[PDB]
Design a protein around this motif. Structure first.
Motif, PDB file in Angstrom:
ATOM      1  N   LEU A 271      -5.626  -5.929  -4.320  1.00  0.00           N
ATOM      2  CA  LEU A 271      -5.182  -5.868  -2.945  1.00  0.00           C
ATOM      3  C   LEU A 271      -6.415  -6.464  -2.181  1.00  0.00           C
ATOM      4  CD1 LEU A 271      -3.597  -2.603  -3.619  1.00  0.00           C
ATOM      5  CD2 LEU A 271      -2.217  -4.448  -2.670  1.00  0.00           C
ATOM      6  N   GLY A 272      -7.422  -5.866  -2.605  1.00  0.00           N
ATOM      7  CA  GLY A 272      -8.603  -6.545  -1.723  1.00  0.00           C
ATOM      8  C   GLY A 272      -9.123  -8.100  -1.781  1.00  0.00           C
TER       9      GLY A 272
ATOM     10  N   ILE B 146      -4.991   2.803   3.239  1.00  0.00           N
ATOM     11  CA  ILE B 146      -5.312   2.973   2.109  1.00  0.00           C
ATOM     12  C   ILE B 146      -6.085   4.364   2.135  1.00  0.00           C
ATOM     13  CG2 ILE B 146      -7.029   2.107   0.413  1.00  0.00           C
ATOM     14  CD1 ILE B 146      -6.083  -0.855   1.419  1.00  0.00           C
TER      15      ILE B 146
ATOM     16  N   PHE C  80      -4.700   2.558 -11.520  1.00  0.00           N
ATOM     17  CA  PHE C  80      -4.760   2.102 -10.096  1.00  0.00           C
ATOM     18  C   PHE C  80      -6.060   1.265  -9.597  1.00  0.00           C
ATOM     19  CE2 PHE C  80      -2.083   5.691  -9.498  1.00  0.00           C
ATOM     20  CZ  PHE C  80      -1.130   5.209  -8.395  1.00  0.00           C
ATOM     21  N   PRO C  81      -7.478   1.487 -10.052  1.00  0.00           N
ATOM     22  CA  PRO C  81      -8.566   0.805  -9.263  1.00  0.00           C
ATOM     23  C   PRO C  81      -8.409  -0.604  -9.670  1.00  0.00           C
ATOM     24  CG  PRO C  81      -9.318   2.193 -11.335  1.00  0.00           C
ATOM     25  CD  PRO C  81      -7.968   2.444 -10.973  1.00  0.00           C
TER      26      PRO C  81
ATOM     27  N   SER D  32      -3.621   7.073   1.810  1.00  0.00           N
ATOM     28  CA  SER D  32      -3.117   7.216   0.559  1.00  0.00           C
ATOM     29  C   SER D  32      -4.267   7.914  -0.424  1.00  0.00           C
ATOM     30  CB  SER D  32      -2.839   5.858   0.050  1.00  0.00           C
ATOM     31  OG  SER D  32      -4.004   4.995   0.280  1.00  0.00           O
ATOM     32  N   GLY D  33      -5.347   7.469  -0.298  1.00  0.00           N
ATOM     33  CA  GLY D  33      -6.563   8.015  -1.383  1.00  0.00           C
ATOM     34  C   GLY D  33      -6.605   9.587  -1.030  1.00  0.00           C
TER      35      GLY D  33
ATOM     36  N   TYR E 280      -6.104  -1.985  -6.806  1.00  0.00           N
ATOM     37  CA  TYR E 280      -6.817  -1.750  -5.365  1.00  0.00           C
ATOM     38  C   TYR E 280      -7.638  -3.267  -5.364  1.00  0.00           C
ATOM     39  CZ  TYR E 280      -5.625   2.752  -3.879  1.00  0.00           C
ATOM     40  OH  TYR E 280      -4.698   3.808  -3.571  1.00  0.00           O
TER      41      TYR E 280
ATOM     42  N   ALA F  95       0.762  -1.324   0.089  1.00  0.00           N
ATOM     43  CA  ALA F  95       0.039  -0.026  -0.150  1.00  0.00           C
ATOM     44  C   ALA F  95       0.974   1.271  -0.003  1.00  0.00           C
ATOM     45  CB  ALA F  95      -0.939  -0.147   1.193  1.00  0.00           C
TER      46      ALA F  95
END
Lengths: 94, 94, 94, 94, 94, 94, 94
Positions: free
Chosen positions: C74-75, C22, C67-68, C25-26, C71, B12
């Motif tokens: 990562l999820g 997270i 990016f999406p 970061s966002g 993520y 992350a």
């Protein structure tokens, strides 16, 4: 963030450095070339000074025409490097 | 939170770092390119200075056109890394 | 509360850490992107600065679109980890 | 009130110091810029003094236009620092 | 009243200190900002002084708009600390 | 308020110093240039004094036209420095 | 009545001293300014003496307009000092 030497942040700042350096080089060369163009005059088409000076400006034009392809090679090189990094990751990450 | 070296929080913050670095690089390059565009003028279509300067701006345009694909590769790389991490987890977690 | 290395409280705080990281970061990326958007202007559709700057913002858009999916990976990773923990418990708990 | 070097009162007085310093800097710059504006006159649009003086005020305007983004970066920096402090607390507080 | 370093009276006086410091900081900043507002005038919408001064007040406004979120983070931090203290108590008190 | 050498108050006073110095430099140069413009006269378009004096004022104009870009570089430099500070914070704050 | 150097009676007499000094300074300046106003006359709007004298009274007016903000800073300073004293008491009184 990598395996042995491939670090995406390092690659990012490397791209930063190369881009800014290329920008500064272009800026400096354009500024200096303006001064060169201002300095040299056109004496006459056929006198002594013309014979003395013309091949010099011809070589100037030639070399400055050679630059673009060099920039192209410099551009292509990074794709090769990043591809090699991806392949190296793939090889032993699994 | 991992097995050997795959740490989701580490990933992350790695994404954090790469994103912010890319943002700063884009910002700096845009700001500097504005200055470059302001600095260089357009002397004339066919005079000495045009011959002296045109290939330089051509190479500028070329390299800046090469950048986007590089950014694309940089984007794709992380998916490969994370997939390898998932596979490595799967291999010996069972 | 576990057998060898699977500790539900440890997993809980791990989820805590990843979630907060997270979120931060966002937050940081959104705040910085606002500044980037404010900084860069739109010179003209066809002048020198446009040619100089457009591919950069194109690469920005591309990477931020990449990016999406990252993520998402990562999820998904944590489900794999927790499932492996459950299976490891089952294997030698009986 | 902290773990190693993260002290909320220290952070508070740090914010105090940065805020007051920024206020004083803005005050001083505004006051001095008023004097600058009063001092320089407008000789004529096309005489010698105009050619002599215009680029200077142009650079003034440019740099003072560059300041806002710098202030924005200075503003964003503290969020990063405080977030890092929170994460460091979380890491080994449990 | 604690186990290793978690002392509820110490936490209480820590909250005391942070609260009073934040109050004093807000008081000082408001008082000083009143003086700043009094000092700077509005010369004209389009004259030299306006160009000279406007970005400065813009940066002032920006930074002072950044403060609230910083205060929010400072507020959230203490909950994390106290929760960690509770968890540490629970871990080895039994 | 920092990690090794990055101190936001120090950066603030640094911005203070650079701004005030640039203001004073512009003020002094404008004031002196007014005196220069007053001192030199225009003898005649084609006499000896014109040949003697014209290139000097030409060089004056050139150098004063070179200044703006220098100021632009000076403006851009600080963004690079502050970005590096942010990145250095991020690197080892986590 | 204090801990190291913070003595409320000392602060009280300090406030006494600063107040009386400021009062005397204002009194003296007003009295002297009355004499100045009486001394200087208004010769004529456009004669030699007007050109000789006007900028002097302009500078007088400017400096006397600068005084109020200075008095404001002097007023704000004491709040900072007393707040620091309170904080220092709090720090090691418990």
């Amino acid at each position: 963030f990598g395996t042995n030497g491939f670090d995406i942040p390092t690659i990012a700042i490397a791209l930063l450095i190369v881009g800014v350096i290329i920008g500064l080089s272009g800026l400096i060369l354009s500024i200096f070339a303006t001064a060169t163009a201002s300095a040299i005059s056109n004496p006459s088409p056929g006198t002594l000074a013309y014979n003395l000076t013309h091949p010099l400006i011809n070589g100037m034009v030639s070399f400055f025409s050679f630059f673009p392809t060099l920039y192209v090679l410099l551009g292509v090189t990074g794709i090769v490097l990043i591809a090699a990094g991806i392949i190296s990751i793939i090889m032993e990450k699994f």
